[PDB]
Paper text:
Helper NLRs function as central nodes in plant immune networks. Upon activation, they oligomerize into inflammasome-like resistosomes to initiate immune signaling, yet the dynamics of resistosome assembly remain poorly understood. Here, we show that the virulence effector AVRcap1b from the Irish potato famine pathogen *Phytophthora infestans* suppresses immune activation by directly engaging oligomerization intermediates of the tomato helper NLR SlNRC3. Cryo-EM structures of SlNRC3 in AVRcap1b-bound and unbound states reveal that AVRcap1b bridges multiple protomers, stabilizing a stalled intermediate and preventing formation of a functional resistosome.
We captured the effector AVRcap1b from the Irish potato famine pathogen *P. infestans* in complex with stalled three-protomer intermediate of the tomato helper NLR SlNRC3. AVRcap1b interacts with all three SlNRC3 protomers on the interface that, in a fully formed resistosome, would normally be masked by the second half of the hexamer. The effector wraps around the bottom of the three protomers making contact with the underside of the assembled NLRs. The WY1 domain of AVRcap1b, known to contribute to the NbTOL9a binding, was not resolved in our structure suggesting flexibility of this domain that may be important for NbTOL9a engagement. The remaining LWY domains (LWY2-7) collectively form the interface between AVRcap1b and the three SlNRC3 protomers **([Fig fig3])**. Among the LWY domains, LWY6 contributes to the most extensive interaction interface, with a buried surface area of 729 Å^2^, through multiple hydrogen bonds and hydrophobic interactions. Phe207, which plays a crucial role in the LWY6 interaction with protomer-3, also contributes significant buried surface area to the LWY7 interface with protomer-2. Together, LWY6 and LWY7 account for 61% (1274 Å^2^ out of a total of 2088 Å^2^) of the total buried surface area between AVRcap1b and the three SlNRC3 protomers, underscoring their key role in effector binding. Structural analysis of the SlNRC3-AVRcap1b complex revealed that SlNRC3 Tyr204, Glu205, Phe206, and Phe207 (hereafter, the YEFF motif) are simultaneously engaged by LWY6 and LWY7 of AVRcap1b. However, in the presence of AVRcap1b, SlNRC3^Y204A/E205A^ didn’t associate with AVRcap1b in an intermediate band (presumably the 3:1 SlNRC3: AVRcap1b complex) as clearly observed with SlNRC3 (**[Fig fig5]**). These results independently confirm that the Y204A/E205A substitutions disrupt AVRcap1b binding without compromising SlNRC3 resistosome assembly and provides further support for a model in which the effector targets a conserved NB-domain interface to stall resistosome assembly of a helper NLR at a sub-hexameric state (**[Fig fig5]**).
Author numbering:
A (entry chain B): 133 to 135, 143 to 526
B (entry chain A): 25 to 87, 97 to 136, 143 to 650, 658 to 891
C (entry chain C): 133 to 136, 143 to 263
D (entry chain G): 232 to 678
Write the structure that this text describes.
Amino acid sequence: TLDEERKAPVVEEDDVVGFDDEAKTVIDRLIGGSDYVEVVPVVGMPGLGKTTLAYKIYKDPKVEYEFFTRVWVYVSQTFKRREIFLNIISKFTRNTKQYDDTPEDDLANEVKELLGKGGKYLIVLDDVWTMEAWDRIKIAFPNNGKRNRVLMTTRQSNVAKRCNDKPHDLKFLTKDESWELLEKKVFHKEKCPPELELPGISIAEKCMGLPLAIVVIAGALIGKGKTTREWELVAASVGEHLINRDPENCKKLVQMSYDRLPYDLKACFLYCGAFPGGSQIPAKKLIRLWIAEGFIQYQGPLALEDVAEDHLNDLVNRNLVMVTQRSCSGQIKTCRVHDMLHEFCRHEAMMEENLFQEIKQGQERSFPGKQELATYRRLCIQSLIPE
Amino acid sequence: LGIQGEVENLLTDLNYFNAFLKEAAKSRRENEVLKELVKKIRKVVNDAEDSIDKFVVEAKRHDHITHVARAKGVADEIKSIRERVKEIRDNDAYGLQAITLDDEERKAPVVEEDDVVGFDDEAKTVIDRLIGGSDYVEVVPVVGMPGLGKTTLAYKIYKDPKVEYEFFTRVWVYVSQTFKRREIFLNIISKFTRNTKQYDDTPEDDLANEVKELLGKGGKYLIVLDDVWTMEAWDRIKIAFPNNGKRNRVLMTTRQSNVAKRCNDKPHDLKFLTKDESWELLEKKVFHKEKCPPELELPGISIAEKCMGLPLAIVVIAGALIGKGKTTREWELVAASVGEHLINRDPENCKKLVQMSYDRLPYDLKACFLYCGAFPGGSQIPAKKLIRLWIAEGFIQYQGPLALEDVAEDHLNDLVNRNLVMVTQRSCSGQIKTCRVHDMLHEFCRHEAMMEENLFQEIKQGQERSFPGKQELATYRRLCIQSLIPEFLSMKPSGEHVRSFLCVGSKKIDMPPNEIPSIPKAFPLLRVLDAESIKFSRFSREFFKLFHLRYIALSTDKIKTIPADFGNLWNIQTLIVETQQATLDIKADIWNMTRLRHVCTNASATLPSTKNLVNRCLQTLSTIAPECCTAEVFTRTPNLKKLGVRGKIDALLESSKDGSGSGLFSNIGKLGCLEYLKLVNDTRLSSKPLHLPPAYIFPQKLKKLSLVDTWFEWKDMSILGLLPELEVLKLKENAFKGQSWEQEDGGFPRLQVLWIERTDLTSWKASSGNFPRLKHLALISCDKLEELPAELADVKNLQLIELQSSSESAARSARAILKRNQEKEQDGDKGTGFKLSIFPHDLGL
Amino acid sequence: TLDDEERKAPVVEEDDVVGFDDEAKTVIDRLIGGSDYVEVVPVVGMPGLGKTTLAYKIYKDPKVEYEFFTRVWVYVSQTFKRREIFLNIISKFTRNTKQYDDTPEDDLANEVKELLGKGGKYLIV
Amino acid sequence: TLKQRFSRGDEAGTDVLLKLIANGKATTEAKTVANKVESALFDFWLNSRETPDKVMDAFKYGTTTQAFLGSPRWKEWERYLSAYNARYPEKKATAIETLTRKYGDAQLLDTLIGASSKGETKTLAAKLQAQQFDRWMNLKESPLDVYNRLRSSYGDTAFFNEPQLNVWVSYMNVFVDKNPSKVDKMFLELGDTFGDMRLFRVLGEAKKFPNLESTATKLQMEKASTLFASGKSPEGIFKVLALDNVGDDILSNTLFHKWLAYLQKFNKEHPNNQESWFDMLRISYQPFGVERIIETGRKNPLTRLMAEKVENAYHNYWLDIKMEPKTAFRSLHLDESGEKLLADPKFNTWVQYLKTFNDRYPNEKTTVIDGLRDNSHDIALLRMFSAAKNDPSTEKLATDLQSALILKWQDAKKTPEELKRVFVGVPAADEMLDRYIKLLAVASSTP
Ligand SMILES: Nc1ncnc2c1ncn2[C@@H]1O[C@H](COP(=O)(O)OP(=O)(O)OP(=O)(O)O)[C@@H](O)[C@H]1O
Ligand SMILES: Nc1ncnc2c1ncn2[C@@H]1O[C@H](COP(=O)(O)OP(=O)(O)OP(=O)(O)O)[C@@H](O)[C@H]1O
Ligand SMILES: Nc1ncnc2c1ncn2[C@@H]1O[C@H](COP(=O)(O)OP(=O)(O)OP(=O)(O)O)[C@@H](O)[C@H]1O
C-alpha cells in the first residue's frame, strides 16, 4: 500500500560463432543508403545475440575505418537523458563538471557540435525499449548530411519499424553452429572427446540455436565434469538447467520483457506455454482460447477477435512469440514460442502463478493425487488421456 | 469431519511461517529479538508438521474405539498448536514487522606476509604455471576450502622476486561476496593516475576501456582477482583486461571449483599443511621466536593434528592457547575440546569465514550440508547412503524429469564444487563414491544444527554430558548416537518428537534381545532408522508400528524372512537388510509401497507375489533369486536401473525346451532403464558350464556388467562385445574358466573399464579394435598371465594397468612397453600420461 | 494523506513542420513590431496543438536568428525552481557556475538582467 | 503534533521533519517559518533530554558516515551538542568522545582517515583527529600501547601500511610534543618489538613531521651505516631500508643517495655479479610509479640529470621486454596530445625509440606511418599533416608521411570512391585525395 543499478551487458569479443554473414549484411546497410541519419535496427528475441552482433560490428575493421566517430550508448528500460548526454560528452572532453547547470537542451546541442566536427558518425544505441526514448535522445544526433548512421538493438519490432521500415531480424544459430559454440565454451581450445559428442550434439540441438541457452548450458557442463552419464542427464533436462537451475542469466533476461508486459498481456503470454514445446500453435485457435478464458476484456467498438489479434501481434512485436506462417492477407496464421521462452512460460505459470498444470506420468513422476487436483485450475495434457 | 478443515487452517499458517523462516534465514541481522522469534516459530512449525503427519497416518489407517481416542488426541494436539500460533501473532507482531519490511564491509582481509610455512612448493608450482602457458590471457585459479590459505599464498605469489621481475605491472583486486564493478575499475585507475574525480560522468563501459588502455601501455600484467564467488563476477571484470598477445596472466582465488574450471579447466587445488608444518605454525604463532617448552611439546602436537592441516584452525587455537595460559593441564584440556575453541568460543575470526559459504548456500542445500555433520568427525560417508538419507529426510524436493537420486547427487556435486565437502573416493565412471567433511566444517555443522536450528542432537556419555533426560528428549528432533546404544536404550527413553535415529558407529554391535523393541517404542514418529551398525536377532511387532518410516537399514545374522506385517509401512523408500544368511525371503507387501525406491540385501532375495499398479519409483532391486526375475515382476518395475542376481543362475540362462523362448534372462532385456547388472553364481555341480544367451537378449542400454563364479568360457566374451553401451565390466574369481583368451575383430564399442580377479588366464590374444575407449584394465592376482598383447600399447585411451607379484615375463613386457613409449615420446609422439606403479620398491627396482 | 525527478522538456519536429509557414510569419512579424519596452506575444491553444513546434519554428527561423542577437529557450512548467531558471539562462553566457553557489535568487535575477541587456534586442521563449 | 501527523510510528527518528526543514530553508519564501520550526525541534529535544547519540542517528540515517560529516547536518548536530552541554552541565561529552562511545576508536580511526582523503571533509577531520589524540594522551597511552590495543582489530601489519602509517606517526608527533624527553627510547622499543624493516618504515614517515625530523634522521642514518657494512646484497637492503615506499620524491631523498653510493661500491667490488639500480625502482614502484618518479624528479632542477638516467633506463627496459613501437605510442601518452603531434618533443623520442626497436629486433620492423595508422584514424592524420605542413618546421616529416599514407592507401586497394565517402565533410582531405587519384592514374598508366 506504501513504498536500481545500471548494469550494461558484457558480450564475447573473441570467438563469435555464426555471425560472420550477419555482420557483413548489416555493415553493407550502414555503408550504403541516403545522405541523412539512417537507423539500422537489429531485432530479436531475448538472448538472441543482438549486442554481440552490435559489438562485432562496432569493432569491425571496416566499420572503424568508415566512421571516424563511434559512440556506444547503453539505453535501457530506465534512463536519464541528462546522464546519457553527459556520458556521450565524456567521450570527447574530460572536464564534464563544466556542465553542472547547463540544461539538457544545451547539452544536446553540445553533442551536436562534438559529433559534427569530422566525417560520418556511428552511434550504437544499445537496448532501446521505447520509441519515446529514441525521440528524446535523437536530438543530440545532427542531420548534417554526412551519411551518418545509428545502429540500434532492440527486442521491439514496432520501435525498429518506426526507426526503419525494414528492420534487420537476427538469425538463430544452425545445428552445427550451436554445437561449435557449446564445444568451444566447455572444452576451450581442446576438442570434445568422442564419448561426449553424441549427448553433446543433442544438447546443442535442444537449445534451439539460441546463443544465450548454449552459453548458460555450457556453464552447467563445465561444473559437472566430462563423463558421458552426466551429459545425458543434462540433455534430458536442458530446459530445467536454463530456467530453474539458472535464475540469474536466463530467468532475469526474460523477466526484463515479461515484467514490462501489461497486466492483461501477461496471462495471454503464459497461456502459450500450455501447448507442447516446439509445436505449432494456430493463431485462430490461440485467440479463441484467450477470449474464452476471459483474458480479453474489452468494451470498445472493435471485435474481440481484432483485439486479441493485436495482443498476439504485440507479443510478436515484443519478440516473445515467433511467427512461422502468415496468411495471404498478411494476418498471422501459425505461431510458435521459442524453447527457452516456453520453459519460462512453463516455470512461471505452473510454479509462480498456478495458471495451468501439466498432467503426465513420465519416467518416474505420475499423475497428480487428490490433494493436488483440489488446487489445480487448468489441466493441459498431451498423452495417456484415457488412462 | 471438521478436524480436517482445521488442518487446512493450520497448514495456511504453516505456509506463512515457513516463508517467514526462509526470509529470515536470508539475512543474518544483529537483532537478537528476531533470533528468538525464529527459534520459537521454528519449534511451533516442527511441532505442527509432526501433528499433521500424525493426522495423515491416522486418516490412512482409518480409511475402532482406539482410533476414536487417537483421533481425539490428534484434535487436541492440533488445537494446542493453533493456540500457540495465535500467541505468536498476538505478542510478536513487531517481529513480523521487521521481516515483511526491508532496509565498510569491503575491507580486504589481513594475511601474514612473513613466517609463511609450507607454501614454498605450492607457490613455485603456481609461479611456474604463470610464467609458462600460452600467449593470450590465461587464468590460474587457486581453489580450496574456507581458511585454507588461498589469499596467503596469493599474496606470497604476488611478492616473489620472480613474479615481480617478470611482469610489467602487477595489480591486486579484492572482489568479494558483494561488490560494485565501478569501484573496482576506479581503484585500478587510481593506481595509474590519482585524479579519479574526473570520471564522475564516465560510465563503467568507458571505465573498462580506460583500464584496457592503462594495462595495454606495456607488457605482461598479473591481476590477482581475490575471492571471486560467481561465474558472472569474472565475466564482468575480465572486460577490463586487454588481450594483446603478451602472455598476460590472472591469478584468481576462490572457494568454487566450478568457477575455477570456467577460467581454466585445470584448477590448482591448494594443499593442506602436513603434520610437521601444522605444528610448526602453531609453535610460531603461540610462542613467537621462542621455542616450545618440552613439557608443552607433547600436547602441542596433539592439537596441531586436531586442525587437520588447516592454517585457519591453527591460528584460532593459537589465540585460545595464549588466553588459557601456558600449563600442561590446560593444554591437554584444550586438546579434548578443540571444536569448542574453533566455533563456540571464537566467533570473531573462524565462524564468520565459514558462514560466508554457508549463507550463500541455497535454502535446500543448507539442510543438506548440516546433515553431513551428523556422521563422526573424520569418518567416511558413503555417497549413496548420504543421498538416500537426504531423500528420506525430505531435503530433496523435485518435480522435473530426472530421478531424485540424480538430483540429490547434483546437490552433493554442488557442495563438493563449493569446497564444503571433500571427495575421498571416486567410482570407475567418476561418480562420487565416498565423501568426508573437514574438521572445522564438521564443528560448524554441529554448532549450527544443535544450538541454532535444532536439526539434530547427539547422544553421548562424557565427563559432564550424561544421557539426556525426558525434558531434553521432548525437544530433540533428530538423534545421532555413536556408541553405548544398548545402555542408552536400557533407560526406556521417551522421545515423542524424534524423526531420525542415526547409528553413526563403525563397528557392529549385537543388540541384546530384551532391548530390541526399544527403538520403535521410544520414538513412534521415527522417519529414518539407520541401524545398519546394529545386528538384530529378531523383528518385533513394535517395528511395524513406525508408519512414518522411510529409510530403514539394519543388519542381522538370524532373521531369514521379512515378515508380512512389514508391509504396513507404506511410506518406506529405502529397505536395506544386510544379512549374513544365504537367502532372504521378503514376505512383506513391498508392491503396496507406492514410494519404494531401493531394496538392498546381500542374500538371495525372494520377492512376494505381485498380484494394473506400477512401482514407478523403484530404482534398485539388488540381489534377488533367479526364479523371481519373471516378466511379471519386471512389468511392475519399469524404471529399474540396477539389477542383481544371486544363487543358482542356471534357472536364468536355461533354454525353455517346451518350445518357447521365454527364458528368465530374456525378461531382463525388457527393462529399458537398466544400466548396471550383477550376476553371482552359487551352484557349481552342473554337468556343463553355462553359456551366455545371444547379445540381442541383453538390455541394450546396459552400461555396466559384473559376474561372479559364473564359469563362462573365454570364447563367450566376444558376444559381450556386441553390447552397444557397455562401459564397465568386472569379474571376480572363477567368473571365467579357461587359460586361452581370444577376441574377434571389433566389439566392445564403448568399453572403458575392465576388471579381472584370480582367473586361470595364462595366454591372451587380442586386437586393437576391441579397445576404442578403454581406460582402466586391472588383473588382480592374475599372476599366471605370461605377457600383455602388443596392441595394448597402441590404445590411446589406456590409463593404468596395475599388477603386483606378477610373472617375470609380465614385468619384462611392462618394461618394454614403458621403454618404447618413452622413446616414442622423445621422438615427438604426444604423451598419454601412462604410469606404472610397483609396490613395494624391493621388487621391480 | 502522507503523500509528497527529471525535467521532461517536450520534443518536437525539427523538420517537416506541416502547415505552420503562415502562422510562423504572423507571430514573427508581431515580434518585430511593437513598443520599445518589453512586450509579450503569448501563443495559446489546446494541449498538443503545436505551440512548442511553432515556438521552435520561430526560435530557429532565419529571420529571427538574424533579428534577435540573444535567443533564450526556458522550459517553464507547472512545477519549477525559480533559481534553476536564472542559473540556466546564465549558463548560456558564462560557464563558471561555481561562483553562484550561494548567490541569492534576486541577485541571480540581477545578474541575468546584465547578461540580457548587453546582448541587445533579445527574444525569450 | 507534527510527529503524529507526519509519521505513523516506526519512523526510527525524525527524518520526515528534518527533510522538510531543509526544504523550507532552501527558499527565502519559507525560511522564516522553517527556522521557527527547527528551533522548536531543538527545544523539543532538549526539553525531553534526548541523548545526543540518538539525535546524531536522526541526522545520520539515510546516508553514510562519510557524507554525514560532509553535510550541514553535522553542523546542526554540533549546535545541538553545544546547547545540550550548556543547558545540562550534570553530564557532558565532547564531539569526539560521544563519537567514540558509538564507534569504537578502531572503527573511528579509518572513518577520520577516510574523511581526510575526501578533501571536502579534510578540515572537519583535522579537528576531530586532534581531539582523538587528546583523549588518548589523557588515558596516558604510549604510541605502542595505541598500536597494541588497535592491533586486535586492525591486524598485525596494518599500521605499517599507508594511510594508517601516517596517522600513527602523526600521533607520535603529539605524544613527543607534550613529552619531548622520551622520544629517543620510543624508537628503541619500536626496533625491539619489530624488525629492522618495520622500524625503517615508521622512521621514514617520521621525517615528514617537524617535531620528529631531528631524531628520525639521527636514527635512520646510523641504522643505515651499520647495514651497509654487512655486505648483504643491495637488493635485500633496499627493501629493508623502506626505500620501496618513499614515494615520487625518492630521487631527492637523502637516504636513497646513500644507497646509490653503496650500490655503486658494491657493483665495482663484484664486477661479475653486477646489480642494477633501475630494476629495484621498477619492481617496487611499478612502471607507472617510475613515470611519476621521472616527471617529479625532472620538475626539480637539482635532480634533472638523474631523472634523465631513469628515463633512459626505462625506455631501454622497453626494448628488453620487446614492446612494439605502436604500443610505445600509447605509453608515451602521444594518444592524448590531440593534433599537430609532429612538433611535440615526445614524438621525437618515440621516433628515436622506433629506430632503436627496428635496429635491435630486425624481424618486426615498422616505420612511423605504421605506428600512427595503428593508433589514429586516417581522418586525424589528414588534420595533423595539414596542420604541420604550414609550420616553419616539420614540413619534411609531414610530406614524407603524406606520401607514406598514399602508398598505404593503394596497398589495401582503396578506390577513390571509398576514400571520398569516408572523408566526407572534412577539409584538407580533398587535396590529398586529388594527389591519390593522380598517383593511381599514373600507376595504372605505366605499361
Ligand atoms: N555468436 C555468439 N557466439 C558466442 N556467444 C554468443 C554469441 N551470440 C551471443 N552470445 C552470448 O549469448 C549471450 C546473450 O547474447 P547477447 O548479450 O548478445 O544478448 P541480446 O540479444 O543482446 O540480449 P537482450 O535480449 O538482453 O538484449 C551473451 O552471454 C553472449 O556472450
Ligand atoms: N602457510 C601459512 N602460514 C601461516 N599462516 C597461514 C598460512 N596460510 C594461511 N595462514 C593464515 O590462515 C588464516 C586464514 O588464511 P587465509 O586468510 O589465507 O584464508 P583464505 O583461504 O583466503 O580464506 P577465505 O576462503 O575466507 O577467503 C590467516 O590468518 C593466514 O594468515
Ligand atoms: N505542425 C506540426 N507538424 C508536425 N508535427 C507537429 C506539428 N505541430 C505539432 N506536432 C507534433 O505534435 C506533438 C505535440 O505538439 P507540441 O509538442 O508542439 O505540443 P504543444 O501544443 O506545445 O502542447 P503542450 O501544451 O502539451 O506542451 C509533438 O509530437 C509534435 O511533434
